[PDB]
Amino acid sequence: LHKEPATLIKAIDGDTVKLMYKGQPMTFRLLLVDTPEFNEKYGPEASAFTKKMVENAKKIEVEFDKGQRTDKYGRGLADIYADGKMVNEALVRQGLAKVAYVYKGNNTHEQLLRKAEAQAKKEKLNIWS
Ligand SMILES: Cc1cn([C@H]2C[C@H](OP(=O)(O)O)[C@@H](COP(=O)(O)O)O2)c(=O)[nH]c1=O
Ligand SMILES: [Ca+2]
């Protein structure tokens, strides 16, 4: 899998970010995770966590997986990195997202994310408390 360059346009919520990718604005939905909606418990924390992570980054990178690249809403589906750190993983490690929406073809980092979710669960972090 390849890391491609992109630049923050705007933080959206826990698992969606607007980025400029190949010179075009686009909404990215984070692969393999599900954060609570802003209106739900831990929703504001997950939005704040992703925000701080994408806004503090010197470098944002987008990585597509081996299946579908855009969903039925036209959102890009990707792993997002912030100065080398995967946002998808970091959210699950902190108990602010569940592993979810696992479809074959687009699950390269599945095991990694489950592994984070187990430690979060062990620590009773956030969603698991
Ligand atoms: C993460 C992800 C979501 N989706 C779609 C399925 C869901 O459809 P429905 O909207 O029909 O339920 C929706 C969930 O996104 P959200 O969690 O952002 O709402 O996005 C994909 O198709 N592939 C993906 O990899
Ligand atoms: Ca969500």
Side-chain angles (χ1 to χ4, degrees):
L1 298 199
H2 301 135
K3 285 180 206 168
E4 298 188 49
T7 80
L8 191 58
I9 294 170
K10 216 188 120 270
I12 299 164
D13 72 348
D15 57 23
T16 58
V17 63
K18 182 101 84 98
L19 307 170
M20 200 186 282
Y21 171 66
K22 291 161 133 114
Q24 306 301 329
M26 149 176 15
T27 298
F28 279 89
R29 175 65 162 80
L30 291 190
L31 278 178
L32 304 164
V33 304
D34 194 44
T35 54
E37 287 296 309
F38 181 90
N39 95 280
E40 296 162 347
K41 190 161 207 236
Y42 297 104
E45 292 70 12
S47 295
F49 180 99
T50 298
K51 192 182 206 275
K52 174 160 189 255
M53 196 173 168
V54 297
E55 276 178 3
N56 285 2
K58 261 95 214 307
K59 176 176 75 177
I60 296 312
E61 281 160 317
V62 135
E63 175 194 69
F64 299 100
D65 207 328
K66 304 169 247 282
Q68 189 77 40
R69 282 178 189 211
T70 82
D71 64 17
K72 77 224 224 271
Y73 301 101
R75 299 178 304 184
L77 300 160
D79 303 318
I80 310 301
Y81 295 75
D83 294 330
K85 292 163 97 130
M86 206 200 306
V87 178
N88 312 67
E89 187 198 359
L91 281 157
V92 175
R93 178 61 184 78
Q94 295 304 312
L96 298 170
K98 288 172 166 181
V99 177
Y101 300 104
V102 191
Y103 301 99
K104 281 32 160 79
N106 265 352
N107 71 340
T108 300
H109 295 299
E110 189 174 6
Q111 279 185 285
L112 181 80
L113 275 48
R114 290 196 186 288
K115 184 75 185 279
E117 192 181 84
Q119 264 296 80
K121 284 190 186 194
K122 216 259 206 187
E123 292 169 20
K124 262 66 160 221
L125 248 36
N126 284 312
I127 279 177
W128 313 112
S129 63

